[PDB]
Design a binder for this molecule. Structure first.
Ligand code: A1Y
Ligand code: A1Y
Lengths: 296, 301
């Protein structure tokens, strides 16, 4: 149990860096362009790798020239791809990302290619003994709940010192995913999900959604410039102010930087308060740079 | 491989990777949306004309700037898919292979474009100097970096001076963008294509007005051509006779993107086949009109 595993998506981010967001029906030239390996679980593996944590990525990929770019990027970062669910049907998903250089805002137009998702069958083949931590990016909820029931069953047959710590991410405001609330030691709920459920702050969301988490779980909600908050079994609300850079240039994957940094800090035995703080610290650092290089 | 002497039609200009996404609604800044469909296409004027020439049955070559990388790889495989000779590409050690993001709102049909960056250098006169011209029977230049292209055109003129009339390379130029620097290109080539957009920005309200008002800018013996979409196209040569062909509209209009490039390549093809200017005008109108009722370039011939 020496590695952190992230189960989720790997998407090709085709990036255009603009000085201002284009008005509808307008024609504006971009400042610069780059291809970036994206996908939430995939971005968190980049961050975990830079933090010095051995990690593995599990997600669906389709053989082609794009997957060769993605795989070469994963390998250059030392991310283990041995668990990848290579598919025969479907193309590798790609997205057009417009990054506003003046405020760091990122607009994503995702092309979801109907690539078959990672299944409980794919997960059943995985050797759970090499993993210290397993993070699951909420996608195919019913099929992931089965992956989560499999980790819990393994845990019950293991000593407390050899148990696999589990984290879940509920980013999209999709009702199917609200069952995952639900499972795991740490539950990351997005600001978008929280707002969609009628909450105007991180503290409100935590108080209103805690009843949905597993006994003894920590519910975490980041709220951009408002920093981030956490709530555990003790009922004590924990807050961390954000660490915004003086110039916010790229927020693409900031939330993924936060999740990965919180997971790394907890996996290192640090307190929830310290982990919240470290999450905001690394995410804030990322926001003042293009991509993920130089975050540490 | 071995290209026979005076066998190819060369087009010099832009190649860009256009990523086109169809959306339910225009995305609001800082949001993550899912497009209805996404297409990766090879674009650019000279690039589109190259595809059309291959489909017409002509050996053709593309000359343009690319930087090694994944974008270039996609573009090279798309050129090769269309039988385009890619050996004259000006590879660049600095800059980005052009890529554009187009967003189409499915509801109103509006097109929002994030254009490629200006980082990649255009083909230069020194890059063009290194080209052995003997395998080309026709060279078409898309007006971009005018001062450098003027020298490319002077080089061809020099080459032609030393050749018997049967081994002279025919030349065409396209002034498509309403940019002042491009207007000096009107004085070069045997055939000059002027866009409706340029004509309008110069105050002309019809293809007849544009040709009459701009013919003085062309070199002796040149033919000035202007397509005006639904109004068809005109041509004017040294005899002073305004030639015209009506448009050949398709039953339903599907995709007009690259219709001007289809017209250009078809007029060039027809002229290179020894057909008259009137026959070339008609042929260009027919092929471009058929293209408009088709998605992309499949089945234009
Ligand atoms: C979108 C967004 C914008 C900014 C300015 C920050 C920062 N700093 C940020 N993070 C806050 C901490 O939690 C992770 C995200 N996210
Ligand atoms: C944009 C545009 C729209 C339409 C409907 C046509 C036609 N027909 C057309 N072409 C006319 C011939 O010359 C080339 C262009 N172009």
């Amino acid at each position: 149990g020496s590695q952190i595993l992230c189960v989720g998506l790997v998407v090709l981010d085709v990036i255009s860096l603009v000085d201002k967001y284009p008005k509808e029906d307008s024609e504006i030239r971009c400042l610069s362009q780059r291809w970036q390996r994206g996908g939430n679980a995939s971005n968190s593996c980049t961050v975990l790798s830079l933090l010095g944590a051995p990690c593995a990525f599990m997600g669906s990929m389709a053989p082609g020239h794009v997957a060769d770019f993605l795989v070469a990027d994963f390998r250059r970062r030392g991310v283990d791809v041995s668990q990848v669910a290579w598919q025969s049907k479907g193309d590798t998903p790609s997205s057009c990302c417009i990054i506003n250089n003046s405020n760091g805002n990122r607009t994503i137009v995702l092309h979801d290619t109907s690539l078959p998702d990672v299944s409980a069958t794919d997960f059943e083949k995985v050797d759970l003994t090499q993993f210290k931590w397993i993070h699951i990016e909420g996608r195919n909820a019913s099929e992931q709940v089965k992956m989560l029931q499999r980790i819990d069953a393994h845990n019950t047959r293991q000593p407390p010192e050899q148990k696999i710590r589990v984290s879940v991410e509920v980013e999209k405001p999709r009702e199917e995913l609200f069952q995952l609330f639900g499972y795991g030691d740490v539950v990351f709920v997005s600001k978008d999900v929280a707002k969609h459920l009628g909450f105007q702050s991180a503290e409100e969301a935590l108080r209103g959604l805690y009843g949905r988490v597993r006994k003894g779980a920590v519910l975490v909600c980041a709220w951009a410039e408002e920093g981030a908050d956490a709530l555990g079994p003790d009922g004590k609300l924990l807050h961390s102010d954000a660490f915004p850079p003086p110039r916010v240039v790229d927020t693409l994957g900031a939330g993924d930087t936060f999740n990965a940094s919180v997971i790394f800090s907890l996996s290192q035995g640090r307190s929830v308060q310290e982990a919240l703080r470290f999450g905001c610290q690394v995410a804030g650092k990322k926001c003042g740079l293009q991509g993920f290089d130089g975050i540490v």
